[PDB]
Amino acid sequence: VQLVQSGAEVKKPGDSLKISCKGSGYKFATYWIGWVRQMPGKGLEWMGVIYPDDSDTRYSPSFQGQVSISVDKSITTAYLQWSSLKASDTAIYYCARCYDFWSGYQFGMDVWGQGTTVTV
Amino acid sequence: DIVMTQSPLSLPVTPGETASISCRSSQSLRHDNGYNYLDWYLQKPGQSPQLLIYLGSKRASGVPDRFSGSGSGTDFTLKISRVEAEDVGVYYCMQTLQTLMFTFGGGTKVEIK
């Protein structure tokens, strides 16, 4: 029950982007991929969540349309796929097994990736 | 609503002593299905945040049993009896508002004496 992501993506601003997080040894189609932010010198903030089985997506109102993510059921992999870059995206990011749909639990998140560093 | 309680923030603490953390805000925090949802977690330096779960803190993993908690109303509790020298980590509690809102605890972390 494991996860892997791309390494640091250090570059100048403006260019279109993607980064991937892959789940393995677990039922990847059947738990959402939720996300979190940490910029340099900052706490934690929430980006959104996407369902692997059918791509039902609930992007945070703080980010909606300023972001895009997708998922493929076959290679057990999901991705940020953003249309450009922003100085203010320069952060460590995250992926996880998600909240809700547990037969009970809200929090749920108990399977986690190694992190990735998008950086202008 | 808002960045919820840190309670406490952070102070130099000596090993093997005692601490606790309190999760609260103006929000109602207990839906009528009657569990409270407060959604604790914790994280060491070097990432991987750690299940401390919905019920005013709880868990279902091998994370050390020096961490435990409960509560009521809008105001909920997690406890750190035996503040062990390895736990130089950060404690957080999480919202409940579905697709709306985007908020977590205000950066409560260990410092040493």
Ligand SMILES: *[C@@H]1O[C@H](CO)[C@@H](O[C@@H]2O[C@H](CO)[C@@H](O[C@@H]3O[C@H](CO)[C@@H](O)[C@H](O)[C@@H]3O)[C@H](O)[C@H]2NC(C)=O)[C@H](O)[C@H]1NC(C)=O
């Ligand atoms: C099915 O739904 C019912 C109706 O809400 C659930 O009842 C709730 O049960 C919990 C105990 O697990 C009660 O928690 C206690 O709340 C008080 C404050 O009200 C607090 O002082 C205690 O520390 C404790 O947290 C809760 O009162 C109760 N109902 C409501 C409306 O709060 C029930 O748990 C659910 N059953 C199952 C099997 O899931």
